[PDB]
């Protein structure tokens, strides 16, 4: 209690609607899907190679 400092934002957070929207763009989501795909693919490849 003695040490806490409040920004205005952390106060607005409490009385306000909750966003259904993460800030993630169309293109950002494209790259997310591509990244996940690429990494998963290489990890499965690697594991099959150990087998």
């Amino acid at each position: 209690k003695q040490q806490a400092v409040a920004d205005r934002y952390s106060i607005a957070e409490q009385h306000s609607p909750l966003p259904l929207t993460t800030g993630v763009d169309r293109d950002a989501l494209d790259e997310a899907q591509r990244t996940k795909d690429r990494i998963l693919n290489d990890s499965f490849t690697a594991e099959n190679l150990l087998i």
Binding site: L40, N41, F44, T45, N48
Partner: protein, 74 residues
């Protein structure tokens, strides 16, 4: 005509694995019990004895195919 330029997504995910053994994994071989041979007797024209180790022999084989042979404690 061309309206657009795009980057080609593909889903390469392998998520299923089907490996089938080739036939020759299950083919037979000839396996044998193996003990230390303590001695051997051969006879065809003339008898010959070889003794590697002298002990009381607990097992004895006789084999007739070309030459008569007797594998002692084999």
């Amino acid at each position: 005509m061309f309206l657009i330029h795009f980057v080609h997504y593909k889903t390469i995910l392998q998520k299923y694995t089907f490996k089938f053994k080739h036939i020759f994994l299950s083919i037979d071989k000839y396996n044998s019990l193996f003990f230390n041979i303590s001695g051997i007797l051969i006879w065809l024209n003339i008898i010959h004895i070889n003794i590697i180790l002298i002990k009381y022999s607990f097992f004895i084989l006789i084999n007739n195919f070309e030459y008569l042979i007797i594998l002692i404690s084999t």
